Design a binder for this molecule. Structure first.
Ligand code: SMH
Lengths: 327, 10
């Protein structure tokens, strides 16, 4: 059985509305993790109960090279804890905020790993991810992609079945999600088009701080590219950012397989992608187990952490928070 | 660059 006392709390990696992620050491083993700690009372107040449970469920039910692995999830009277593998390289958002643009080769590597994982989710797990963005893409010690945050996932979506929840991130929303008239798994390829456009072009494909103006652009404005972008990347992003999901690269029965076969990925051996046989073009340059240079100072320089059967409305006992991954 | 974005559901 796992409690909070089993960990030493080292560095704050990030902080938000619902809680925090702390770099931790498991006392018994000496292993390092990222522990996401959420307040139950804030979860309930903001109606995030069902999404928390989905995060938990998808984490426990997934095993893939480019999906964040969960070691433990447990709970206290007022907290929910997910002990995840520590992705040393931080968010792709961290990197892109600084380098501004990635090379096409580097974006191809990241795109190939994102597709491999979304392919796995759609095909093996009948899951749609729905929140693809730079914040949810992390790099591991070797420079490989880790997708995080599965709370907006949709389970039990086979082939062409549809979803109706209006959700995601405003900047990244697919036109059919904004149309609010049912959507399929191809919303993930829109998201893929957005993040790859950001990597190769240095900006969002559509932006405006006023959401009403933002949503207008995503719905109405044809996709444009910086004129330095090469022809095979222009071809990929145009296909992914087709506003009609039936026209979208990946929008048909073949799904990811359509994207995998596009000329932009021409010499990608998709099995080698799965097997991590492709060498990452950037290896995180950390100097110790606790080096957090790829996390904002705003967090890392701060301070960290601030009844076993209580089941109340403000602090519910959550099911399936008794998890420890089998070896 | 762009500010951090926030996930939502309604
Ligand atoms: C039920 C809804 O739960 C939603 C919970 N929120 C969403 C977060 O999980 C977003 N999430 C995106 C990927 C990176 C990060 C922060 C981090 O350093 C980190 C390091 C890791 O090895 C693994 C996951 C991580 O999560 C935060 S959040 O906004 O509260 C928040 C924010 C924005 C920032 C830091 C922590 C938290 C907890």
């Amino acid at each position: 059985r796992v409690t909070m006392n089993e960990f030493e709390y080292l560095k704050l990696l990030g902080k938000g509305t619902f809680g925090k992620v702390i770099l931790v050491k498991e006392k018994a083993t000496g292993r390092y993790y990222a522990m996401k700690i959420l307040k139950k009372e804030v979860i309930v107040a903001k109606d995030e109960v069902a999404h928390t449970l989905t995060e938990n469920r998808v984490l426990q039910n997934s095993r893939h090279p480019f999906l964040t692995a969960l070691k433990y999830s447990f709970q206290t009277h007022d907290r929910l804890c997910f002990v995840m593998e520590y992705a040393n390289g931080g968010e792709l958002f961290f990197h892109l905020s600084r380098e501004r643009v990635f090379s096409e080769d580097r974006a191809r590597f990241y795109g190939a790993e994102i597709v491999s994982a979304l392919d796995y989710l759609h095909s093996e797990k009948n899951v749609v991810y729905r929140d693809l963005k730079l914040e949810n893409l992390m790099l591991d010690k070797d420079g490989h992609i880790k997708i995080t945050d599965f709370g907006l996932c949709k389970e039990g979506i086979k082939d062409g079945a549809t979803m109706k929840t209006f959700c995601g991130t405003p900047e990244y929303l697919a036109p059919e999600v904004l149309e609010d008239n049912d959507y399929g798994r191809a919303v993930d390829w829109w998201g893929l088009g957005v993040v790859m456009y950001e990597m190769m072009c240095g900006r969002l494909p559509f932006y405006n701080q006023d959401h009403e103006k933002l949503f207008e652009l995503i719905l109405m404005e044809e996709i444009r590219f910086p004129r330095t972008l090469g022809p095979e990347a222009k071809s990929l992003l145009s296909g992914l950012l087709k506003k009609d999901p039936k026209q979208r690269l990946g929008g048909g029965s073949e799904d990811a397989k359509e994207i995998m076969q596009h000329r932009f990925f021409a010499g990608i051996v998709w099995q080698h992608v799965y097997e991590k046989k492709l060498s990452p073009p950037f290896k995180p340059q950390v100097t110790s187990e606790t080096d957090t240079r790829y996390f904002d100072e705003e967090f890392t320089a701060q301070m960290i952490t601030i009844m076993e059967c209580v089941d109340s409305e403000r602090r519910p006992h959550f099911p399936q928070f008794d998890y420890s991954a089998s070896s | 660059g762009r500010p951090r974005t926030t996930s939502f559901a309604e």
